[PDB]
Amino acid sequence: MKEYTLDKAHTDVGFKIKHLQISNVKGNFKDYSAVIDFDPASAEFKKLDVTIKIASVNTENQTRDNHLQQDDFFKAKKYPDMTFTMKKYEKIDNEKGKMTGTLTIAGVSKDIVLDAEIGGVAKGKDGKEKIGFSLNGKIKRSDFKFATSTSTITLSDDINLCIEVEANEKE
Numbered sequence: 132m133k134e135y136t137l138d139k140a141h142t143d144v145g146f147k148i149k150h151l152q153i154s155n156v157k158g159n160f161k162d163y164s165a166v167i168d169f170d171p172a173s174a175e176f177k178k179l180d181v182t183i184k185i186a187s188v189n190t191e192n193q194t195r196d197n198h199l200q201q202d203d204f205f206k207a208k209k210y211p212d213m214t215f216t217m218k219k220y221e222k223i224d225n226e227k228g229k230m231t232g233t234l235t236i237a238g239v240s241k242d243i244v245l246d247a248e249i250g251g252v253a254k255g256k257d258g259k260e261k262i263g264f265s266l267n268g269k270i271k272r273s274d275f276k277f278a279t280s281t282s283t284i285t286l287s288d289d290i291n292l293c294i295e296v297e298a299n300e301k302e
C-alpha cells in the first residue's frame with residue numbers, strides 16, 4: 132500500500148436528507164366586479180354580488196397562476212368566472228355581522244357564511260358616502276369538488292377567504 136492525505140480544498144464530506152415544509156399560498160385576483168347595496172343608517176348589507184375572473188388569479192408566481200387555469204384546478208376555459216351572491220345578512224351590531232351566500236366555483240354551487248367586519252363608515256370630505264369592511268371564512272375544497280386529483284395532504288382542504296373592500300357611493 133501507500134498513504135494519502137486529503138486535499139481538504141477538493142474533498143466534500145457530504146449528505147442529502149429529504150424534508151417537508153408547510154407554508155401558506157397567499158393570492159388574490161386582479162380582475163373582478165361587484166354590486167354593493169348598504170345602509171349606513173342601520174349598518175346592513177342589502178345586496179352583495181361578486182364576479183371574479185379566474186384568469187386574473189395572482190399568487191405571485193406566473194407558472195402557478197397558469198397551472199391554476201388547467202383541468203385539474205379552475206378549468207378557466209370551461210368556467211371562466213367564480214361568483215358570490217349574498218342571500219341574507221344577519222347583523223350582530225354596527226361592526227359585525229354574519230353574511231350568507233352562494234359561492235360558485237367551476238360550476239359547483241354551495242351556500243357559505245362569511246364574517247363581515249365593518250372597518251369604517253363615513254361621509255367623505257366631498258359629501259359622498261364611503262365604507263370599509265372585510266368578509267372572511269373558511270371553505271372546503273371537498274365541498275366544491277375542487278382540484279379533486281390533488282390530495283388533501285399536499286394541499287389543504289381548507290381555503291381561507293379574506294375580502295377587504297374600500298368602496299364609495301355611485302353616480
Ligand SMILES: *Sc1ccc([N+](=O)[O-])c(C(=O)O)c1
Binds near residue numbers: 248265266267295
Ligand atoms: S379578511 C380577514 C378578516 C379577519 C381576519 N381575522 O382572522 O382576524 C383575517 C385573517 O387573519 O385571516 C382576514
